[PDB]
Each structure stands twice: as structure tokens, then as C-alpha cells.
Amino acid sequence: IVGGYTCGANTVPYQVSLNSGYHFCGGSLINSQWVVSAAHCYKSGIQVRLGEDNINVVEGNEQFISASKSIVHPSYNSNTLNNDIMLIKLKSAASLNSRVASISLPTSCASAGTQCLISGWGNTKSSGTSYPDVLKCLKAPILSDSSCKSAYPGQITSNMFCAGYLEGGKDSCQGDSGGPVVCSGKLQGIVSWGSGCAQKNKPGVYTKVCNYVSWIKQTIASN
């Protein structure tokens, strides 16, 4: 997260870190056994880490649970990043509490102008590299489809939306991939892509979760 703030320990209780020897992506806990992340975060050997703040220190509220299976969206295209969504099932159910909690799926799509919370452990610089160890947060509005398409001609599908600031300076970044965009207590987006980070006229692009609720519910119900 570039141009954000330190969230505060366990203030984003649905935020997970995906770990394969090291943090490589974020995710969102949507019930006791399932995490939603980006399809481009797919790999084998995933451990889901819940209750994290400093991802380099065991602080006492963590739960570490290995994934039993990952399910990439059947229509995911890794070239265009269309349908950039994946489900991860935990080998055992997480113990839900005030610091480890699921986030609700949307009942309706969120509109341009809606304020959302984006979070993650990704790079905090737009040029160069600095990875925080504590969770970072950014409040950002959803942008209009027209401004999104104008920023990224030929690249924005009906399964994507832009959020952030056209002036630059505030954005998600590398390492935030797969993490949540939450608006009015609903998971509306997944950190997907962008051209660099926090660059003028290149806002963050996010997977439009409301298009996938039926797929998510049906997949969970049979897996």
C-alpha cells in the first residue's frame, strides 16, 4: 500500500496473508474454512495465516492453517487478468473471534464514488521498494467505469473496476495482490493489477466480486 496508514493490529480481521515460506499475497476470509484471493496468486504449498499484524513476528493472535485445495476461476485468463479470482479451502476451520472474522459477500455491486478500505503488506513506495511488516490500510473511492476505461484503454472488462486517485500517490501495490477491497462492510474487490503503483492516471484495478457471488456460493457448497 502506497500513501496509506498503519491499520492497527487486528483491526482488519478478515485480512489473511498467504505464505509459502514467505508472504506472497493477501486474501479475505469469507467463512471459517474458505478464503477468496486473486487467481494470479495461485501456487502450490499455501499456508493461510490469519490474525496477523506484523507478519515477521508471532504476536499471539495468529492461526496458521495449510490449504487443502485451491480453485481458480474456470474462466481466468492470465494474460488479460479477466476473472482474476480464486478460492482457497483451509485444512481445518479457523476459530472465529473479534480478531479473526469473516467478511460478508456483496448482495449488490458497489457504485462509483463508494468509499472502500484496501489493505495489505505490499510495497509502500511507488519508486523503489520497501515492504512493511505491519498491515497497511488505504481509504479510496471506486472510480467511474468511464474514467477507468479512459485510464486503461482496451484493458477493462465487465469483471473489473478501478479504485483510488487519478492524481496518484495513493494505491495498492506489489504484495497487496489478492487482498480485500471492502465497502460498507462487504467484500467488493480483490487487489488485481495496475500500471506501476500510485502513478498519475493509473489507478488500481480490482476484481469485481459481486459478479462472482453465485460461483463462490455454489463452489463452497460442493467442495
Question: Where do contacts with Ca ion occur on this chain (CB under 5 A)?
Answer: 52, 54, 59
Tell whether 189 is in a known binding site: no
- The one catalytic residue among 53, 84, 102, 192: 84
Taking the complex as a whole, how short is the minimal distance between the CB of residue 56 and Ca ion, in angstroms?
7
Residue nearer to Ca ion on the CB measure, 17 or 177: 17
The minimum distance between CB 55 and Ca ion, in angstroms, equals: 6
Q: Which cell is 200 given?
A: 498519475
Q: Is 199 annotated as a binding residue?
A: no
Known catalytic membership, residue 84: yes
| Residue 54 is assigned to a ligand binding site | yes
Q: What is the DSSP letter of 33?
A: T
Q: Which is nearer to Ca ion, 49 or 208 (CB)?
A: 49
The DSSP-derived string for 91-149 is SS-----SSS---BPPSSPPPTT-EEEEEES----SSS----SS-EEEEEEBPPHHHHH
Please confirm, yes or no, whether 73 is among the known catalytic residues.
Answer: no
Q: Which residue from 63, 91, 86, 67 is spatially nearest to 76, judged by alpha carbons?
A: 86
Q: How far is the CB of 52 from Ca ion (least distance, A)?
A: 5
Task: Specify the residue for cell string 495482490.
Answer: 177
CA-CA distances (angstroms) from residue 70 to 60, 88, 105, 140?
Answer: 27, 4, 19, 29
Annotated binding site: 52, 54, 57, 62, 171-172, 174-175, 177
Annotated binding-site ranges for substrate = 171-172, 174-175, 177
Please enumerate, by residue number, every residue annotated as part of a binding site for Ca(2+).
Answer: 52, 54, 57, 62
